[PDB]
Structures are given as C-alpha cells and as structure tokens.
Amino acid sequence: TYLEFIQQNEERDGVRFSWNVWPSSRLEATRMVVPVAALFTPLKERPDLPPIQYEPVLCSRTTCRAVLNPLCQVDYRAKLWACNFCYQRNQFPPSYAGISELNQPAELLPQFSSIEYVVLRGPQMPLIFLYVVDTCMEDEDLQALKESMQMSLSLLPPTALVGLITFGRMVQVHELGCEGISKSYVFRGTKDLSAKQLQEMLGLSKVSNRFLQPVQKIDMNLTDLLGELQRDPWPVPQGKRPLRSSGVALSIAVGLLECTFPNTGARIMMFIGGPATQGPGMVVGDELKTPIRSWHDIDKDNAKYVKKGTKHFEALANRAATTGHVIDIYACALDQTGLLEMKCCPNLTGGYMVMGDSFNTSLFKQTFQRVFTKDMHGQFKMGFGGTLEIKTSREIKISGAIGPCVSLNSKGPCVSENEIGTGGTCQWKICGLSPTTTLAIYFEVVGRGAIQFVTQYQHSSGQRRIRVTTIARNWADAQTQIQNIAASFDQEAAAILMARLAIYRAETEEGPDVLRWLDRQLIRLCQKFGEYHKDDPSSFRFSETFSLYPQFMFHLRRSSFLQVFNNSPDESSYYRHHFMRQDLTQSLIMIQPILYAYSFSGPPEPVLLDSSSILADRILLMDTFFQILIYHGEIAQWRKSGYDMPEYENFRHLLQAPVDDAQEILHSRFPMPRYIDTEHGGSQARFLLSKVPILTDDVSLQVFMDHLKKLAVS
Template structure:
C-alpha cells in the first residue's frame, strides 16, 4: 500500500478520527476530480471507540448563522482579542465568557491539534430513557418458542434498569400485553386480517387524547400524570396512559418474565395443507403506532422475532395454502409475484413512519425457509436496525447475535446510540453528493449540498435511528472549483462531520470530527500517492450495492468494469496497445483484485452498508490462512492452488468461519493420530486454527456460521465457491498433477489471471480478438 503524504498511516488516521478517504490529496478542479474516476469519498464511523477522548461537559461553540460550524483545531484564533475565525465561512466570532482564560498555552481540548475528533456531553438530558418493544411470533414449533422465550428472559437482565419495555405477541391475532396490570394477564387483541389505521390502533389502546385521561377499558383507574420511572411526560396524557404497556425494566421484569414464560403456541388450528396464520405486518404496525403516538422523536427499538412469512392481513407475503409457493428469485426478476409490490409498499410506509421519529426496527428471523425479508428490508434499512437470519431460534447464531447486540461498554452502558442525526459541512471548494448507509434524508439544504447525487443526496443532514461503534457511513463529495481557477499554494479543504445522538446513559452527546486534506494540481504525483485502495474498494462497492437496488445486475457489473478500466488508464504505466508493458503503481496493485472478488461475491447488502473498512474488505475478499507442520500460520492466496493434502485452511468470509482439512490431515484425524503418543505436534496443528477461529468469533456481530469440513466433503463447497478458480475442470490440470497445482474447481467463472489479462488489454486499447 502506498504511503500517504502525511506521517500517520491510513489505519492510524482511522483510529484517531474514524475516517478513511479514497484520496488523501484532492484534485483542485472539477475536471481533474472527474478524471480520477473514484470520487472523493470517505467512510466515517461516528461512534468509533477512542480511549483518549477527554470528557467535555459543556456546550459546543458554534459559528454564526447560517454557517453553524463548530469550533475546531483548524480555526484561526486571537487569544488577546478573544475571537476566532471560522475556516468554513471566514466569519469572525467572539469567544463566549467562559473562555476568558484562554491563552496560547492554555487552550480548551477542541482547539488542540490532537483532538480533531471530540465528543460533547450536552447539558439537556433525554426526557425519556431508551424504549424496547419485543414483537414475538407465536406460530413457532414448541422447541423454537421455548428457546426464544428463554433468550428474551435473559435479555431483560441486559437492558438498562430504567429502559422502558413493552410486549406484543402475534399469530392469528396480535396482542398488546398490559404489563402494568399485575393482578392477572391482560392484553388488547387486534384481528390479524384487518388493516388498522394508526388512529384506530391508538384509540383502541386508550392512547388517544380523548381516552388517555379517562377511565381505561376494563374499569381500572387511569394512571397518574407522572410517567414511568418518574419521568414527566412531554406529551401529557399520551405518555402517561402508555405506562400500562411500557414500563421500566426494574419495575416490570418480574411481571414481564412471567408473561413471556407462560406464552403458548398460537391456538388457532392449522390444516396440513396450509400455513399458520401469521399477522406480522399488523404486529409491527401496532408497535410503530404506539411509539409514534406516545414517544415521537425519542430513542426506541422495535425488536421483531419471526419464524415464517406473513400470511394474514397487511404486509402479506404469501397465501395460507401450501400449494401457493413463496416467490422465488426467478419470479421477482420476471415481476410476476402476486403480493410483492403491495407488501413492499406497506413495509416501506412503516419504515418511513419509524425512521422519521428515530425509532429503529430489528428483524430476527429463525426459519429454514424464507420469511419475506425482501419485502420487509426497508424496516431495517431505513432505521439501521439489526437483521439476523438463522435456521432456528435454538441456534447459537441467533442467541449470541441477539445478546451481543445488547453488549455493554466498560462503564456498563449499552454500546448503541439512539435517535441520531448526522450532518456534514464542507469548505467552498467541495460539495456533498450524498451518503450511502442506513439513513434517511433530513431534507436540510445548505451551501454544502452539491448538484451531483450519489446515494441519498440533495441534503447535508441525515437521520440515523440507531448507531453502534461499528456503524460506518459512506459520504461522497464533488470538487466544484472550475478549471483555470488556481488555488493558493498549499490550499486545504475542510470537512466537518457532526453526529448528535442519545447515549444509552440518557445523555445527549455530540461527536464532532473535523479533517483537512491538501489540494494538488491535476496529474501531480501526490494525488496518486494518496490513494487508499482499501477504502476506495469499499466505497465503490457501496455505490455498486446502491445501484443494484435500482438497476439490473449485469448493468452494475458493466459499470464496475468500466470504472476499473478508466482508473487503470489514468494511473497505470503502459505503451499503447502493448498489454505486456502494463504496470500499476504500488498503491493501486490490489485494487483490481478487490474488484474481481467483489464481482463474484454474494454480499449481504444490509451488513455491508453498515460495516467499517476492515469488515467490508473481509466480505469482499475473504481471508485465507494456512496451517502446516514446522511453520508458522501464514496468509495464502484465495486461490485453488492453496488447497494441499497436508495443510489446514482457515477461511473468514465475515459470514462464515470455516476450517478445512486437507485430504491427508483429514485421514490422520479420523485415524485419531492426535490422541496417540508421539503425535503431539499433530494435535497442536489441529488445535491452532480452532483457537484462531474462536478469536475471530469473539466480537463479530452477527455471529458467523462456524463450519468444520474435510477435503471432498459436501461442506467444502463453502470454501471452493470463494476461491479464485486458477485450476478448473476446463484447464486440464487436476489435483496432484504438478508441483503448484491445487484442487480443480468446477466453475465457468474466469480466474483472476484471465480477468487481469482482459483488464490489461482493455486498458491499453489493444485488440481483444
């Protein structure tokens, strides 16, 4: 990897500021920027964990309207006159009175060069603690339901004691459980086949203004004016009446545990030729309606646990009769799916209502068959909710992924931010094209908004309903300086990222990162030397994934190929029409390889659009480690030649961790040599990849599928599908036929070598005949 012009490496910059740029020196004009092919863009991790961030317990100092940039180390300051000049708009601003002791040697943290990232703890606490609503499918097999109930009871002990919790169960009907009523179980039932308007739902629950203060259904007296946990409701009787359904964990844990433990399977009989009646759409609608009416614009999560497709009411994905098959990829491609458009529109509408209010929706699917995630994807994509797919709720993949989402930091707080807003500001030479990630537009038009749109654009602010320390947003920029308008020597551009969110402690926090990069004339070697090929590969893959939602897959692949060819034509050294002369600079060497593996990869788009650079690269180009006798474990080529009879391979695709035993190793293991005296080194060899695999599993979420297989075994397909097929059934080479040949892979895909040969020919303009 080419070293950037500044002293720190790309990784060190990421550790400090949580940001990686495609280019770390920027072209100075619009024309030159378009010629660099890969746009100026960054992957930014707002809640990147930093041990050295000082606690700042006061409000940030902002520039005058309309700029509103926040004081940062790049501001010019006059300590004698107590003024500072904003680098974004060049306005002069007075320091507030509490900065009266400022001197060149006594500066507040936000002006120190090492704190280009700083986090303010704002004085106004959140009026409502985080809210969690469990939405549980009861049409499950008994074993699955028992496992799910057990996991949910465990999760209650992981929530903050003051967090508000609620429970909705659904099958043929949807039931909202009144956990504030301790005398006997009580719930409000909604007919699964009916599509209720939000207003009807809140009226039936007694949450409307007319019924909230009145006697509640069933004759019980209405709640007091003080809300749960002593919180004075901002919505008056709206929130006060919700205390029946949403209560602090510390008050409701016993009651809620009892209700969950006593849950039984949906009693409605299911004929052998029919699917269970499952009103998933209605249940989610009830949860969203409850939250938007009682706690708008607050931190909340709706956690949906489903074991099959919606077969009843709004959001129906497939009919109840088994003879009606659930839609296939082929059906979707042909646009011949009976319920698809209507269901997608319904869930998209729900996601908009939730995301506008800062409410996240998680989907945990435990089912061997499809559950309709394609129709429901907007629920998680728009709100940055978790999406975990497991074969069953009894699996470790589900249990550990769900409980790991509730992990705590060293101070004992949940590692998640709620109800966030992400804003970006630029100096005049740059404009914002858009963001790709699980966000929605906040429709804020400022001088920083550009004309070109990449991802979600035409705004400089976005709503992010949920944030974790790994959540990363791709931000794309354009240079707007016209050609022929020279910049001052040593001119720099500035970008400020501002993230406002509700911390799990109940405080509002403001994370501010301000970064500066130099401009250079087009063609200057510093631009090529500043290329971060890892970040660029991830940023281009996000564009490809965004395009794939709109365009056909072949069109997206052709776009990726065109971009790669243009990049090579711009930065490689070659003689025209001479492929043998083609040479890429050092800092571009593995970029084509990333693109080759990206074209072949089957990514989970939801996870890629939230992941940081390192995790995204593992998804694009999995890592492969080789373990052999008398040598240290080493990374090897993701290639069929790496398969050997006397080695063990450890594959990490992010979604799978696979240990693959070569033919000889597998035979020895089956003969149990590892348990015999004198074979201690063989035992150690078998254990080494297992220990390394456990380390990889330690902090990954969702939990990868863990596979142990042998050469020739059926599960070896998970490895073979990821390898570069340099030896195939078409090449004539077979396993063991030469000193460098590996296992033949049965595929029609071209190998990396063939891909590179084609790339060189196209880049240099040679004939491809």
C-alpha cells in the same frame, strides 16, 4: 508513510478517504475514476478521549454554523476566532476568558480533531424496548426465544420502559403491571391501523403507560407473562401455513410508540419465526402448495405479493424513521421469512437484521446477547436518534450518503446539484447506531480543504451528546502534482466506496449493466494511473498503491453481493444489509475472504484465495464475514486414522491451532458467523471451492487481468 497516514486517521477521526490529496479543479476530478469520498464511522471506538462537559462553540453565521475546531485561527488578544469554513469572525463565550496560547481549550488541540460533547437538553428519557413476538413456531423455538427475551430483560437499565406485543392469527398488545388479572387488547391481524386510530382504541392521551412500564417495576410481572406465553392456539390444517400477521403487528408496534413516545430513542424488536401469510405485509400464500418467492420467480414476474408487501413495510419504515425509533428483525426459520420485503425497516432505521435456522440454536442465542454488549462502564453500546450534519469547504459539495440513514432534505451551500445515493441534503437521520455503524459520504469538487462531521445522538443512560469530527486534506494542482495525488490513493477504501455504489445501483431499476459500468471504471483507472506503453499489454505494470484494486474488483463482481441467483432473496438482503453497515476492515473481508494456511512447516500465514493454495498437507481457514470454514487437506487421512496418540503431540496441536483462532472470531464478531468443518472430498467442501459487452465471464483471476491488461493499453 501514506500507510501510516491512513492508519492514524482512521484510528483518530474514524474516517477513510478514497484520496487523501484532492484535485484543485472540478474537471480533473471528474477524470479521476474514483470520486472524492470517505467511509465515516461516526461513533468510532475511542477510549482515549474524555467526554467534554460543556456546549460546543458554534460559528455565528446561520448558513455555516460550524463547530470550533483546530483549523480555526485564534487571536487570544482580541478573544476572537475565525471559522475556517465561512471565514466569519466569532467572539468567545465569557467562560473561556482565560484562554491563552498555552492554556487553550480542548476542541482546538489537533489531538482532539475528533471529540465528543455532553449536551444539556434538560429531559433525561429512559430507553424503550418494545418486544414483538411471533407465536407460530414449535414449542422448542418459542421456549428458547422466551429464554433469550428473559435474558435481554435482565440487562436493561432499571428505568428502561419495556413493552410486549404478541401476534399470530390475532395481534395482542399486553397490559403490564395489571396484577390479579392478565389483560390484553386484540386486533384483527388482517386490517391495517394508523397511529391515531390505535391511540384512540387503546385509550391514550396525545403526545410510563399501561403498556410501556419500567423494568424495575414490572420485572416480576413481565417474566411471569413471558414464561406463561404459549403458541398460537388456532390449528393449522394440512398442506397449509400458519396465519401469521407480521405486517399488521409491526404496523401496530410502530404506531404504539408513535403516539406515546415520539422523537425519543426506542427499539421495536420484532422476532418472527416464519413468513407473514395474512396481509398487509403479506409475504406468501397460506397454502403450502406454493413456495416462497425465488429470485427466478420474482424475475419472471411470478411473485404476486412482493410489490404489495414491500410497499407496506416501506411506508412503515419511513414512519418509524420520521418518529425516531429503531426496528430490529430477528428472523429464524427453516425457510424464508420475507426479509426482502421487510429489509427497509432495519435498513432505514439503525435496526439489526439477524437471520437463523431456529431460535433454539447456539447461533441465535449468542448473536442476540451481543446486541446488548455493555461498554466499560455498564452502558449499552447503542446510540439512538442521531443527526449527522456535514459542512464542507466552499470548493466541495456533498453528493449524498449510502448506508443506514434517512435524508432530512435540509438544503444548503454544501449540497451538490447532481446527488448520489441518499443525496440532496446535508443532514441524515440515523435512528440506531453502534460504534461500527459506517456510512459512505460522496463529495464533488468545483491551503487545505476541510470537512466537518457533527453527530448529535442519545447515548444510553439518557445522556444527550454531540460527536464532532473535523478533517483536512491537501489541495493539489493536478496539472503539476498528479504523483502527489496518486500517492494519497486509498485502494482499500476506494474499493469499498465503489462496491458501496455498485450495490446501491443493484437495488435501483438498473440491471446487469452494473458489472458493465463497474468494469468501465476499472478500465478507466488503469488507463490513467497505469504504467505502460500503448498496445503493449505485457508492458503494463501497477504501482503498489494500486495493484490490489483490480483483484478487489474481481472478487466483488463475482461475489454474492451482485450474483444473487445462487442465494435466496432473503439471503441476498441479509448480506447487503450488513455490508453497507460495516467499517472498511470487515467490509474488505466480505468482498475478498481471508484464507489462512496452517502446516507443520511454519506459522499460520495468509495465502491466496485460489485453488493453488489447497494442498494435501495443509489446513485452510477461510473467513468470509458470514461464515468460518476449516478445510483439511487430503491431513484428512491423519485425522481419520486417529493419530489422540501421545507420540503425535504436535499433530494434535496442528488440528487445534486453527480451531483456537476460530473460537476467538466466534465471540468478537457481532453477526456471529456460520461455522463449517469440512475436508478433502467432504460434502461441505463446496463452500470453499466456490469462493475460490462485459469485461469477462466467471473466469479465473489471471484471465481477468489479461483481458483487463490489453484493454487499458489501447
């Protein structure tokens, strides 16, 4: 089955291609509406694999330099192997000498198409966690945030280096381990600073410090300091906002590591409780009379701080990426914090972006601890400073990537001229990644084709490692075997890959022509792979490999990811940040939420995301990735009437049945979603009904297909 080919390749190689059979010519590849592209998750969870304890054998050609893999022919008599990418003849290391057809090395076995090596760099470096704490928040939020920070401190390895920066009207870089007296370095929260300046002013050498010190040495001192921290002392006048210098404190945070520990793994965890009011990075004015930017404000050219503030964090984000450090942003506040301006920091590095109402909620405390999830061996599920290089067969050229990445602008034979997204390169830099981290690579065409994904990352516990993934797909003559190509179509994966593209166009200067282009392709795909007689819309039918794709486009073009004007600018940034970060499975849940139905007549079964599925005798469980909603059908009266009564044992289990699954999702999912319990006529029923020339308006799914049906046949 092709559905088993997809499931077994996503599970084995962490890859999911839009097509598993490629056209043998650039021309016919262009006419296919969805390009040859794949969702690659470089560190996919795989407990079946051993970590191989030696260096990967590499192709001796300098321009190729690929890794030995099962697709490489082997002549055990001559002790040579031929690289399947450039065809170079390659000798073996003398330690392999005893290699034979039956006792071959691991990297050649097809079971190990994806494999991980353990490198021997020689320097084992500790992890660095730099806290950057906002102190302009009620004593509730700060006291809870101190507990979340003391908790994270307990989970870090003993050798890890911790560092504390706090800010408010001022910015303070604290000296740790300085006992008998508490001392800190202070800077005006209104003036920018470079890393060289900060290196001099703090009195540091070039390239443990007094500011970054091991956990085991300073556990007692930092927890005492953490517990003694109190709010920004400077008072806040009426009708005014606190002077919060978030842009400056981060510029000092990035610089503090840039001149002490460059080119190593580190997290700059910035916790903010409100918008930055004292520039640079200034999000909004200090007076409460003016409100924070709205999508209509920034549209009317009426948000005078956006362009200035973003360019600060923009340049700040590139500095951190070029240095090799992660920037997390934990932003809890009853209003916007400026995530739109700061999104580049967790987007270009591998940082997390966590939103919230307040740090004293079950939502935030739980979400923050999931960051520090440990694996089966007590090591964090984090990796740092990753180089993702991609080699392709000489008939394929890389367009570019989309997701948490920064181009290394390393040209080569695999780089295409016309590039897509973060293109013009064969290498990307991912500062912080997790098993879930998922990019979108885009390819171009000009007996199997092959692609290799090599990822060198710094695993926790300071062990340098290299993750190698080598995949192959079949060549096909599209003038003779369209059917063989259309059978390999991955409608699920092709849906995300296009949404991945359509949202990247939404950040660029391009406007609502995205919907216009998004439908131009959808129509093209129906005309090519659709069964129909011309101008007979009713005659048109879908293959079952394609039927779901138009419904995916429907829920995408009407989703939050492209219709921002019902959300805040920070919300839209929160959504897009996670979507271009997720594997296929969770990405699908985002676009088309999953709706389950529970009733006395049968087990829980997924149902259509339409108002027809809303029935009086039915409990619904909706799952968009960011919220979990439970809807009681007009069952609501059975609930309000209290049927606790021992006679109705079953009705007590029907109410409990969807909640029991909801608690399961409320521990597994990393960005722990908002929970909603509502019912028929409830105030919060709004969150369900809403989730239930240009091609069409906000029209139902049936009319969407009808207009699509009659266009594809003409």
